[PDB]
């Protein structure tokens, strides 16, 4: 449900994620990279299931960050897809894909895959 | 069938893959790059379902190549997972993961992901 997803979260590499869950299924906020810093802040946008199957199932969700802001442009975008699991220690478990803009000849190696776990603070 | 899989297959990049399929499930052969070339050749090994289902379901299969031979060593390895579909235009549809050996600090972006379709033409 919206309330529980809203807040500040951190993953195992030390990155920050700040998010608001709206009543229509929308997600908005900010992703911060290299151990905080002032502006290595980027915009994020996503969607979640607002009427979850409830008994003890997780809530499905996902979001995108394109790595460009007013100071830097890495010419790449990452998408995270996973689930929210409430409890006394709430968690988000994800798998992610990172794609870079390449020339035709290098498109075969444009995408990296990995996984992150987020803890609410 | 095993001898359906047995042969020479080509992907959309020009790479040639030569495989022998054994009756009990073994897969063995050679992979080579640079649309031919002399020792652009590497060894491969794998496994496949030797007793598939009897409606029009494909045959599941997979294999590994480590990228070291007598002349080169790229300190990486690729695995392909997919299925075989027979008939007049037989095909092998796959997705693959490439992992490189890294230092701890570079472990987060060790793995690339992609997809390949192999035909006999």
């Amino acid at each position: 449900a919206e309330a529980g997803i809203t807040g500040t979260w951190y993953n195992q590499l030390g990155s920050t994620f700040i998010v608001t869950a709206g009543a229509d299924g929308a997600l908005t906020g900010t992703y911060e990279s290299a151990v905080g810093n002032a502006e290595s802040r980027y915009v994020l946008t996503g969607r979640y299931d607002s009427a979850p199957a409830t008994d003890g199932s997780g809530t499905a969700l996902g979001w995108t960050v394109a790595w460009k802001n007013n100071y830097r442009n890495a010419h790449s975008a990452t998408t995270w897809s996973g689930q929210y699991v409430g409890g006394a220690e709430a968690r988000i478990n994800t798998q992610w894909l990172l794609t870079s803009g390449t020339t035709e000849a290098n498109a075969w190696k444009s995408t990296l895959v990995g996984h992150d776990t987020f803890t609410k603070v | 069938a095993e001898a359906g899989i047995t042969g020479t297959w080509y992907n959309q990049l020009g790479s040639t893959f030569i495989v022998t399929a054994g009756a009990d499930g073994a897969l063995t052969g050679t992979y080579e790059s640079a649309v031919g070339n002399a020792e652009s050749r590497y060894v491969l090994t794998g496994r496949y379902d030797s007793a598939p289902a009897t409606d029009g379901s494909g045959t599941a299969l997979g294999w590994t190549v480590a990228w070291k031979n007598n002349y080169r060593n790229a300190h990486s390895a690729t695995t392909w997972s997919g299925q075989y579909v027979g008939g007049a235009e037989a095909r092998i549809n796959t997705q693959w993961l490439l992992t490189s050996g890294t230092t701890e600090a570079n472990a987060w972006k060790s793995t690339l992901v992609g997809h390949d379709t192999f035909t006999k033409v």
Partner: peptide, 8 residues
Amino acid sequence: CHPQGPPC
């Protein structure tokens, strides 16, 4: 040093 990674 990509912004999704650690201080790199």
